[PDB]
Every structure is written in C-alpha cells, then in structure tokens.
Amino acid sequence: VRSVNFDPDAWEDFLFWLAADRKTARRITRLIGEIQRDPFSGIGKPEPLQGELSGYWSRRIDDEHRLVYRAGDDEVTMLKARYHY
Amino acid sequence: VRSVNFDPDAWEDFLFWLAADRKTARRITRLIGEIQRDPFSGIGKPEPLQGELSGYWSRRIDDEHRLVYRAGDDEVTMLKARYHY
Amino acid sequence: SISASEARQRLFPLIEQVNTDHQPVRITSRAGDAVLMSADDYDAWQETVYLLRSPENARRLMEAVARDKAGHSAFTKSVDELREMAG
Amino acid sequence: MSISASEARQRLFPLIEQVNTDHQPVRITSRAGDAVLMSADDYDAWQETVYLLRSPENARRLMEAVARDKAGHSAFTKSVDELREMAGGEE
C-alpha cells in the first residue's frame, strides 16, 4: 500500500546487484517489501540515523552494505543500496 | 620551529580569506603559528581525524571552517583552510 | 559535563536519563573523559558514522540526500516488479 | 561481553580509564534500559571526521588535497612571517 520510490543512484545500485550478486538483489528486494509493510521495525536491524541524516533510516543488506531510506505514511524512498569505497 | 608547507588548494583558501575576511586570515595565521610550535595542542580544539583520514588533524578556524593538516618533526603541511558546500 | 565521582554515585538515574532524552552525558576524570549514551543511541550513532566515514560513501549518500530534499528526482517501482527482476 | 549497571557503577573509575586506553566502548545493561560508555576523545574525533565528510563538495575537495599530499608533488613552502605580512598580523 505504501509506494516505493528510488533515487536514481539507489536504482543503479539495484541494477548493479542484479548483475553482480543476485542473492544480494533478493535481500534488497525482501528488505524493501518489509519496509513498505512497516518502515521502522522488523528485519535488517533498522536504525534511525543522526545528524545530517536525521529522518533517514538504514537496514543491513550485508555486514557491509546498507539500504538507506526514508518513510512517510504514503511512500517509502530508497536513497542507497550499496556501500562505496 | 617546524617549516610550513601548503597544498595548492589550502594556499588558495588563504588567498580567498585575504580577499573576503582578513580577520579570518589572521585566525588562520595564528593557528599555523601555534601548529608549527606545538602540532597537536593549543587553540581551535585540535582533533585527530579517523579512518581514511587517519594521520591528519583538524583545528577550528570558526564554528564552520576547519584548517586540516599533517605534522611531523621537521614540517607541517596544510591541506585545507575552508569548508565547502 | 559531570565529574567521574558524581557519575559513579548517580550512574543508575544517569542511565535512565540517557534512555529518556537521548542526549549523551559527558564525564570528566583524571584518567580521561568519557561519554555515556543509551545503547539505542550509540547504535544509531555508530551506524551514522559507518555511513559517513568512507569519503566516497559519504559523498554519494549525501548527494542522494540533497536531491531527495529537492523532491524531484525519485521515480516509482512496484515490489512485484522488483521481485520479478531479482528472480 | 556486556556488564551490569551494578558492576559498571562499582568499577566506573577504572572503566573510564579502560575505554580510553583500549579504545573499546563498554556496553552496560540495566532495568531502565542499556547504555554504552566510551572515550570522549574518540567520540569527538569521529564526530569531527564525519563533519568534514558530510558535505559532498567538502569531502571531494579534501580527498583531492589528501591524494596530492600522498603523492607529494604539489606542496610548497611559506614562512609564517610571510603569512603575517599578508594578513596584517595574527589573531
């Protein structure tokens, strides 16, 4: 019922995983589903970020990679789905 | 005491301040004076930077701008003296 | 900022406090200063720092943040089409 | 590896030295909820690191300077006297 939006970069992260490691892409897909259902609790250890990231949340895709998002009553928006070096 | 080196962008930072606010450039000069005599203590709340920035230090020029530098036994190098948005 | 001596006497309600208002408490001593925070707030802090500590990751993320704040770059996807693709 | 609030309070003097010496935060559990005690210096140093990286343009300009510095081809020398002359002193 909550719609899913992507920032362009988050979308490219998703594309990247579809080709790079598809289980990671399935992880992300499961995470998104659970976020949509209720954005602030559940799997992947959701954390309310601080400081300049206040209002944003992260869930763990991997021990390394994080899905960072924002959520309202009508929509959830994905910001990133890959950790960069 | 120690000799002082500037990265070209930190030199441009100083020039920038000479033209926009000479008081700020005088605070920068004061900090560099303190740094060459006693690298890691003094005014500006010197902080050891962490992670990838490990080995560099920051002091406060004001609540916004930071002088970031590296220091050794013979020399001190300034990398930046301005915060950018 | 409180001294280590009072923090030791008052540790219990200082733990209730940090769990109530989510502000760190700074403690001073001769062995060095410490920060006390709630476990929840510490986890949120460590994760915030984790996202921001790699300069490349900080840049991409905060650029995403800036465009999200301008509210005109995002586009839509259904979770079914996502499951579709990841299959 | 967490300790009780009872133990933490008993040992708080040496705990403060410990978290500062091993640079390792300790987790504390209690009936009111849990807490974490850590080095104030490490806390401040990470906040400051994160302050520098949290603006994309700043992070970019800084790492470019850091990259040049590691190569060590671009840097040049000035005396503080020179700086003082140009700035009209120091303060």
From Swiss-Prot, chains A, B:
Highest taxon listed in the record's lineage: Bacteria
Database matches in InterPro entries: RelE/ParE_toxin_dom_sf (IPR035093), YoeB_toxin (IPR009614)
Keywords: DNA-binding, Endonuclease, Hydrolase, Nuclease, Repressor, Toxin-antitoxin system, Transcription, Transcription regulation
Family membership noted in the UniProt record: Belongs to the YoeB family.
Protein name, entry field: Toxin RelK
Quaternary structure, from the entry: Forms a toxin-antitoxin complex with RelJ.
Gene Ontology molecular function, alphabetical: DNA binding; endonuclease activity
Designated gene of the protein: relK
BP terms from Gene Ontology: negative regulation of DNA-templated transcription; RNA catabolic process
UniProtKB/Swiss-Prot annotation, chain D:
Annotated S-S bridges: none
Molecular function via GO: DNA binding
SUPFAM superfamilies given in the database record: YefM-like (SSF143120)
Superkingdom of the source species: Bacteria
Transmembrane segments: none
NCBIfam families associated with the record: phd_fam
Quaternary structure, from the entry: Homodimer.
Entry protein name: Antitoxin RelJ
